[PDB]
Design a binder for this molecule. Structure first.
Ligand code: HEM
Ligand SMILES: O=C(O)c1ccc(-c2ccccn2)cc1
Ligand SMILES: [Cl-]
Length: 393
């Protein structure tokens, strides 16, 4: 019934060039079995979307990595939002929704846009930059920790902790095990900054604590919800912005459309999230025997979703391998779908829009002038280095 494949979606060969293997996974059937890790997989849009929108059957409380929390100990206390099912998930979800709300975006937009314009101006003075370290990393590092209300000391732990979190969703391979081995200094830093005394008033972190009054969360839950934003809100945006810059360098015709209408900035970032999804894969666990696309999956089985594959599925998208900044992108799963759909997507979009708007208004060309290096992660997709020359407009 279910085809068995030996493709390892957590191998460097797969990270290097996942597209061909993803077509193989999509075309083999709606549900495959991956013998390498003894998990089910779904690579088509329809099944990925269906799994995401059935949290009762495909739960998150048993972890969204390979590890099954009913069988193995989590490497850190479970997330109160990501690794929770309704109804436990509902109230921490509503709090983060209100912290990361439209009204909060109105308060940070001017500073985020000023910082993005200032960065592009700074980068234009140097001409030849690394679009990862000097842009995709430097810009969110200059707005997000300040938006959280973090102190200055110790921010070098932020990206390492994030890379650890997303590597840890993988199998016990060298990427995951190495990350955990070096994790103690990053965990200590992050956990300490999650305490209310260490969070600046007016920031995202202090606002989470300020919601402990309402009956939605208690004070003992607030540090873990701060930890959620420090886990999921930095490295994802770095890879998203890097993907957008990468796309604009590979598709100069799309950079030229963006220059002619900077108001396409928000959709050009959204298309980059569909085209080069920063988070390529993660898991659900079945809570019972379920039929999916004509196949029966037993209870307590891990199901690997290929989000980047669903976003390139020609059963859903026309010309899926083309970066199109006027594409109707609604429905892509780059931010998830359903009750867990990225609660910080307004922050991601704001960061990405104002950066691409700054590029649209100030940059004439983006040419790759050096070797492009990929950054390897069990679930994140992004570049290690992207040497580009920026031609000022
Ligand atoms: C390009 C940027 C981003 C991408 C591609 C992305 C992707 C995702 C995806 C796919 C999920 C769903 C996970 C699941 O269903 O198991 C998710 C959830 C989440 N994201 Fe994002 N994210 C981004 C930016 C952010 C930012 C900026 C924040 C916070 C400031 C954030 C915080 C969270 C949190 C807390 C969750 C858990 C929500 C829940 O379980 O209900 N992410 N993200
Ligand atoms: O609550 C946390 O700590 C946390 C929340 C969300 C993520 C995540 C996972 C997969 C894709 C995107 N984001 C990771 C951690
Ligand atoms: Cl931790």
């Amino acid at each position: 019934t279910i085809p068995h494949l030996a493709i390892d979606p957590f191998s460097l060969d797969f990270f290097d060039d996942p597209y061909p293997d993803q077509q193989t996974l999509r075309d083999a059937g709606p549900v495959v079995y991956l013998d390498k890790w003894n998990v089910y997989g779904v690579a088509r849009y329809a099944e990925v979307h269906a799994v995401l929108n059935d949290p009762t059957t495909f739960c998150s409380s048993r972890g969204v990595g390979l590890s099954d929390f009913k069988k193995e100990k989590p490497w850190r206390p479970p997330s109160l939002i990501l690794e929770a099912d309704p109804p436990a998930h509902t109230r921490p979800r509503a709090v983060l929704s209100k912290v990361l709300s439209p009204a909060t975006m109105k308060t940070i937009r001017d500073g985020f846009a000023a910082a993005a314009d200032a960065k592009v101006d700074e980068l234009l003075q140097r001409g030849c930059i690394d679009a990862i370290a000097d842009l995709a990393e430097a810009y969110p590092l200059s707005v997000f920790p300040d938006a959280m209300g973090l102190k200055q000391e110790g921010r070098e732990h932020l990206l390492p902790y994030a890379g650890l979190v997303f590597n840890a969703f993988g199998p016990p391979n060298e990427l995951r095990q190495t990350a955990i081995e070096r994790s103690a200094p990053h965990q200590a830093y992050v956990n300490e900054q999650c305490q209310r005394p260490n969070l600046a008033p007016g920031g995202f972190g202090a606002c989470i604590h300020a919601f402990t009054d309402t009956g939605e969360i208690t004070p003992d839950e607030a540090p873990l919800l701060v930890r959620s934003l420090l886990s999921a809100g930095l490295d994802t945006t770095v890879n998203g912005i890097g993907a957008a810059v990468y796309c604009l360098a590979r598709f100069p015709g799309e950079l030229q459309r963006l220059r002619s209408d900077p108001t396409l900035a928000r959709n050009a970032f959204e298309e980059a999230v569909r085209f080069e999804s920063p988070v390529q894969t993660f898991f659900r666990t079945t809570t019972r025997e379920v039929e999916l696309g004509g196949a029966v999956i037993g209870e307590g089985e891990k199901v690997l979703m290929f989000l980047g594959s669903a976003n390139r599925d020609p059963r859903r998208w026309s010309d899926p391998d083309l970066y199109d900044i006027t594409r109707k992108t609604s429905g892509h799963v780059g931010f998830g779908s359903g009750v867990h759909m990225c609660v910080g997507q307004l922050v991601a979009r704001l960061e990405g829009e104002v950066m691409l708007s700054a590029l649209a208004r100030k940059v004439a060309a983006i040419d790759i002038d050096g070797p492009v290096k990929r950054r390897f992660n069990n679930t994140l997709r992004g570049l290690e280095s992207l040497p580009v020359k920026l031609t000022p407009a």
